[model samples]
Target: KVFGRCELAAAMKRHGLDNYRGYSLGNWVCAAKFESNFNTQATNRNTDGSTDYGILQINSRWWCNDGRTPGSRNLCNIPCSALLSSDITASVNCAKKIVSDGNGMNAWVAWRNRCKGTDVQAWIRGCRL
Candidate 1:
């Protein structure tokens, strides 16, 4: 529920999201922008009976369990509710695992639509990384 550009950049850097799996921080930043506006408390219900969770808006159907999403895989082995908290260590770790599982940032539609091939230096502007 907090963090400005530099703060986010620093956090991402700390968690290795800055250049994870050959994907740039810009991609992650842009995805975060559209997915949750950097809000850790973000959640959205999708039409397909899945809910998106946290700053990354990870889907409950495949990523984490929210208790309400039946048949969720909980691939991250963490509760969906955990992603909604201010501490994003778990979220970052799960996201790394998600990328390593071959999804990359493409796992996020927001990255595909808004971040792909777009110059996102502004997303980290003024960030002393």
Candidate 2:
């Protein structure tokens, strides 16, 4: 899955996304572009100034379980690179889950609608969960 730092890009690239250069370029690019600006080492902290460490805005508060800040890589068995380090399917499927969810995809679509007509990067923040 994730393995560790800077693994997200490598995983996505090796799997099917192709360094965000896949046939499904639109959504794939959007996802990677939305995630840490395609920077695998990108990190974020809680907005409330808490210890909710995050990467790609994956918050500790919501993602934490098992008394572990890293929690399980199998979030609902969805598989994320940040959590699972064995299966690329985990992270790929996890990202698809987020991108395919009704409300979740809506956010991405909304971002495209708002920013697609403008600077796509400026529309990036709205892509966050």
Candidate 3:
């Protein structure tokens, strides 16, 4: 399912994304916007053969376990397919793992290229989060 702005931010906050590791909730929302356009079913393959999954585009190489992607760490210990659901429980949780694991938001180049060091509050401008 596709998530609207407030809806996605609301879910992310519910999962404790707001400043979880010093990054604002808007930062997370902004990453999701550019990463997957808030679509839970999103998936994109990488040049290294890792596949990005879900709204946060969690990478299968380091974060999740796909049948492929040799040397997968499965840090989130979830099947790559688990992230494709609209629930986003896995998505948000795994994103938190990415941050808590010391990568911060830089794990997603999309955030670095677009959301980082910028005012991403516009991503949730009217969300009232």
Candidate 4:
């Protein structure tokens, strides 16, 4: 499903996945804004033959199990399909793992290049809810 800028923040906040490690929900929201255009069903096929899935593409390198990635870790112990769902419970849970893995937002190219160290608080401006 597609998400409104504020709507995605509301959803993620409800799941309590916001601000997991000093990064604000706005940071995640900003990452999501550029990452998927706010749609969970978005998918990407890497040149490595790995599939990146969900609103926030789970990096198959160290966080997802595609079972066909030749040599990717099942660090999240989750199937790649799980992140494809509109429901983000599992996605948020698995997301926490990556953060807990001590990778921080650097794990996300969007965050690393576009979101980190910037004024991501803009993603929160329209959220009156």
Candidate 5:
């Protein structure tokens, strides 16, 4: 969705994707790029390769099966793909909640390592979970 650095940064901020203390926007953007090719519709299979869907590469079937909407894990009504497909902020918020009970930043960390080549636990820069 975003092609320029500034635009990418705006997208990230809107989604609450902040850098670990030492990480930069460039790092996170690279991760998002790798994770979804900047495509909100980007989808990936699990290790088992059963389900597939989303920009963060979440599985549509499994993620949507629970009817699990982002803010309410218990409420089963809204389809996840609908939220994720419509908005990056919605997708990241959902992923982030799954990452650390909504407390830690491991989601971003994992994405950083996956896409940016940064160490999962230790970037050349420093970022604590």
Candidate 6:
């Protein structure tokens, strides 16, 4: 994986992701934890046959090309494999686009379910940002 909570937060800040789309670093960390448990290579198949990719769990329906998922927006213009790699530049880029689209963290179901209104400071506890 790229990094755990603190390291990922630091890296994200270095990449200029702090407060991206008005969402805090802690929101991203919490989303990643619930979505993929910080595993970049994580993939989850939906019952409808679509799959979520990477730590952010980007759905094939809009962001990346999985080839098998029809009606894919491919707005990220990347193969799903790119998100699964240790380097998260492409993943972070795509996530920014997602957030910029006015979706905010609502783009992630995991965030809405588990992170919304939840205290997420613990996700970045001890991390000097």
**What overall lDDT goes with each candidate model?**
0.85, 0.40, 0.89, 0.83, 0.50, 0.88
- TM-scores, one per candidate: 0.94, 0.42, 0.95, 0.91, 0.54, 0.94
- Which has the higher TM-score value, candidate number 5 or candidate number 6? 6
The best candidate in terms of lDDT: 3
Candidate 3 lDDT for residue 113: 99
Q: Residue 24 error for model 1, in Å? A: 1.7
Most accurate candidate by TM-score: 3
> Residues 1-129, candidate 4, lDDT per residue (tens digit)?
888888889988998866778778998888887778888988888897877789888877677887778889888888888888888777788888887776787887877888888888888886974
For model 3, how does the per-residue alpha-carbon lDDT over 1-129 read when each residue is reduced to its tens digit? 999999999989888998888888899899999999989999999899999998989998888999999999998899999999979998888887788876678888999999998998887787866
Quick one: ranking by TM-score, best first? 3, 1, 6, 4, 5, 2
For model 5, how does the per-residue alpha-carbon lDDT over 3-70 read when each residue is reduced to its tens digit? 34456556656666665344455556666566666666665545653343455554444345433323
List where candidate 5 sits over 4 angstroms from the true fold.
Answer: 1-5, 19-27, 47-49, 60-63, 66-78, 83-86, 101-129
For candidate 1, write residues 1-129 as lDDT tens digits.
Answer: 766767777888888887789877877877888999999999999998999989899889988988888888999999999999888798898899888887577888988889888898778877788
What TM-score would candidate 6 get against the native? 0.94
Q: Which is the winner by lDDT between candidate 2 and candidate 3?
A: 3
lDDT of 4: 0.83
| Residue pairs clashing, model 2 | 1-85, 1-86, 1-87, 2-81, 73-83, 79-90
CA shift of 57, model 3, Å: 0.7
Quote the positional error of residue 48 for candidate 3 in Å: 1.4
Which portions of model 3 show Cα errors greater than 4 Å? none
Q: Per-residue alpha-carbon lDDT of model 6 for 1-129, expressed as tens digits? A: 857788888877887787887788899899988999989999999987789999899989889999999888899999988999888788899999998887688989999999999988778999888
Cα displacement (angstroms), candidate 3, residue 42, comes to: 0.7
